[PDB]
Subunit: 284 residues, 3 copies
C-alpha cells in the first residue's frame, strides 16, 4: 500500500504535513485519499491534533499572515477538513482536553485582535474546522459561533462541516438565537447550509420577514416628499431580493416556496413605480 498509509499507521505528524504541503498541486486527490488513509491509522484524533500547528493557536503570526493563506496554514486547514470527513469518534480525553484548550486560547487571541467579528477567512474557518472536529469549548458564546460560521465561507466547506456532530448539536441552538434577533434571512441561510432545514419553520421565518417589511413599506405611504417614498421602496426591494438570493443560493425556487407573495411581480411593480417616482422629480 502507498506511502500515505506508511505515514498514518506510523503516526508521523510532520511527515504527513510535509506530504500534503507537497501534494497541493492537485487537491482533489488529497480529498479522495487523505481521509481514507486517516481511518487506516492508530488513534487519528491525536495524530491530527499534534499534526495541527503552533502558530495557529499561538499569540499572533507570520508577517503577511492575515488574508493570504501560505501552504503551512493551508495544509493544516485541509487536514482538519479531511479528518472531519473521515468519520471517526476515536479521540480519548487527553486529545479532547488539548484540542479544547487549543480552541480556547485561539478564541482569546481573536478576541484581543478586536473581537471574533473581525477575523480572517483563514482564522475563522480555522477555528470552525478545529472546534468542529474536536468539540466546542464551554466558554464559546453563541454569537462567537455565529461569527465563525459567517466568516468561514462555510458553503464550499459544507459536506465536511455537516459531518461534525459537535457542530450539528450546537448549531441549531445558535440559529434559534439568530431567529430571535431579526436575523431571519441569515438564520435560514445557516440552517440551509448545515442541512438543518428540517428543524426550523423556514417558510414561517421568511414569511414573517417579508410581512414585517411589507408593513414597514406601507407605514410610509403618503409621506408626500418623493424621496422618502423612493427610500422606502429601495428598502423593501432590497429585503425581497435578500430572501430571493438566500433561497436561490441553496437551490430553492422562491417562485414556489414563497409563491403567493408573487415576489417577481411585486419587484416589477415597485421598480415601475420607482421610475414613475423619478419622472416626478426632475422637471417634467
Amino acid at each position: 500500500v502507498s506511502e500515505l498509509g506508511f505515514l498514518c499507521g506510523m503516526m508521523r505528524s510532520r511527515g504527513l504535513r510535509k506530504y500534503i504541503i507537497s501534494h497541493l498541486s492537485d487537491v482533489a486527490k488529497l480529498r479522495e485519499e487523505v481521509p481514507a488513509a486517516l481511518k487506516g491509522a492508530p488513534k487519528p484524533a491525536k495524530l491530527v491534533l499534534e499534526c495541527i500547528g503552533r502558530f495557529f493557536l499561538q499569540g499572533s503570526k507570520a508577517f503577511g499572515k492575515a488574508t493570504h493563506m501560505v501552504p503551512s496554514r493551508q495544509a493544516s486547514l485541509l487536514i482538519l477538513e479531511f479528518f472531519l470527513l473521515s468519520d471517526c469518534t476515536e479521540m480519548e480525553p487527553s486529545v479532547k482536553e488539548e484540542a479544547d484548550l487549543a480552541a480556547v486560547t485561539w478564541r482569546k487571541r481573536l478576541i484581543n485582535e478586536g473581537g471574533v467579528s473581525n477575523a480572517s477567512d483563514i482564522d475563522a474557518r480555522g477555528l470552525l474546522l478545529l472546534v468542529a472536529s474536536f468539540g466546542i469549548p464551554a466558554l464559546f458564546r453563541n454569537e462567537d459561533l455565529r461569527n465563525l460560521i459567517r466568516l468561514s465561507c462555510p458553503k464550499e466547506i459544507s459536506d465536511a462541516l455537516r459531518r461534525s456532530r459537535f457542530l450539528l448539536a450546537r448549531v441549531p441552538d445558535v440559529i434559534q438565537g439568530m431567529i430571535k434577533n431579526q436575523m431571519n434571512v441569515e438564520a435560514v441561510d445557516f440552517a440551509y447550509t448545515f442541512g438543518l432545514e428540517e428543524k426550523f419553520p423556514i417558510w414561517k421565518i421568511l414569511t414573517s420577514f417579508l410581512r414585517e417589511h411589507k408593513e414597514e413599506w406601507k407605514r410610509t405611504r403618503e409621506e408626500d416628499s418623493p424621496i422618502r417614498l423612493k427610500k422606502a421602496n429601495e428598502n423593501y426591494l432590497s429585503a425581497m431580493k435578500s430572501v430571493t438570493r438566500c433561497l436561490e443560493d441553496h437551490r430553492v425556487d422562491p417562485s414556489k416556496l414563497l409563491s403567493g407573495w408573487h415576489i417577481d411581480e411585486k419587484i416589477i411593480q415597485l421598480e415601475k413605480e420607482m421610475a414613475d417616482l423619478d419622472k416626478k422629480m426632475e422637471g417634467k
Copy 2:
C-alpha cells in the same frame, strides 16, 4: 480593432464585449481609447453595460485565500464602467436605471453588513462609485457614503471618467459643501479639484481659512516653558501645512503661487528648525 468592438457594441453582444476586454488587458491604454468610441454605436448602451458587469460584481470577491487584489473579471467591469462614462452616452431606459439602482442599494447594504462603507476594498469602493456614477445614485445613499466611496476609490486615475457623470455632478457639490461645514477643508478641496469643480468653489478661501484655524490653535499653546507642549503644537501645525502642500501638488497647483502670501515652504523650514532647537534643548537628562 474598431470593428471587433463596433460589431460587439453594434450587435449588442454582452459576453463578447466582456471577453474581448478581458482578452486585451495586455494593452489597457488603447482599450481605453477605442471602447468608449464603440459604445456610442450600441443601440441601448446603458443596457449593454449593465448586462456587461452582471452579478459577479456586486456579490463577488469572496474567494477564500484572501488578498482583495484584482482578478480580471472585476477589472473588466471597472473598465467597462469607465469607458461607458467616457462615451458621453446618456438617456438610458427607466428599466435599466432602476435595475442598476437596486444593484447599488444592495451592494451598499452588503458593504454596511461587512463593517461599513468606511472600510471597503479599493475595488469595492471604486466599483460602487463607477456604478452610481454611470446609472445614478440611489435615494438611500447618504452623503457620507459618497464621501467614503470617492475617498477609497483612488479617483485621481479615474478622474476625467468620473468627471462625465452628471449624477455625481449634481450630487458632489452638496457633498463638498457639507464637508466644509463639518471641517474637512483640505479634502473638500481635493474633491473639488478632482471633479474639476474649482470654479464653483472658493478654493483659496477654504485652504486659507483652514491654515488660519491651525495657526491660531498653534498660538493657544505657544510660548511657555514646555518643550513638549511646544514641539507638539508645532507638529500639529507643520502637518496641517504639509497636508495643504501635498494636496495642492497632487493637482499640479503650485502652492507657492496660489497660496503665496502665507509663505509655506518658508514656515516649514522655520518650524522644523525651531523643532531641532527644542530637540537639543530638551535634554536635561
Copy 3:
C-alpha cells in the same frame, strides 16, 4: 578605470542614489538573508546614511500611496522600504543631520495622523505598524505619539522577528519602559512581560511580581468558581484558569525562559495536567 574595484551596493550607497538602492534591494528580494548581512555594512559607507534611507523610504511609503489593484502583497516597493529601515537600524549608524531628523519626525507624525483617520492605530496593516515602528525606531518618536500608539505599533508589528534590529534603537529603548510601566498599571501583565522580554529589558522589570499578581488573581477568581450549581459554569471557570496559565507558559517558552525556573514554586506544569485531567473527569461525568 579600476573604479570597478568597489561593489555595486557600495557604489549605490556612496553615490547616494535612493532610487538605485531601492531598485537594487527590490531586485535581490529573492534572497533577503544576504541583503541582511551585506546592506547594513555598505550603509555606513555613504556620505549621509539617514538622509539616504529617508530618501529611500520614499513619498510612497508614509503618504498612503498604495497601488490601486494590488494587495499589500508587496508591490515590492513596500517590502524594500521595510527592509531598508530594518537594515539601517542594523547598521549602527548614529549621528544624523537635524534637518533629516525633523523631516522624518514629520513623516512619522503624518503617518500616525493618517492611521487615526483610518479607524485608529489599533487597526493597522501588519505592514503599516511595522513600517511606522521601524520609522520611529530609526529617526525617533515624535512628540504627539502617545504611549498607547506605541504599544499598538509594537504589538501589531510582529516584533519578535524584527527584534534584533529593533533593539538597537535607543529612541525605542528610551521610551519602551515608560510604555511598559504604563501597561503594568493597566493590568496588561502577560503582554507587558512579553514586551519587556522582546526589548531586552527583562532585567529592568519585576517579571515575577507581574506573572504572579496575574496567576494569583486568576486562582482567586477560579476558587470563587469551584461551587455554585453547574458542571458547565465549572468547565467555564476551569478553561478560564487553564488558558491564563497556558498563556504565561507560552509567553516564557517564547523567550526561552523555563516556565518553572522563573515561576517554580508554582509548579504550573503540574497544575496544567491537574486541571486537564479534572475536566476529562467533568467530561465523562456530564
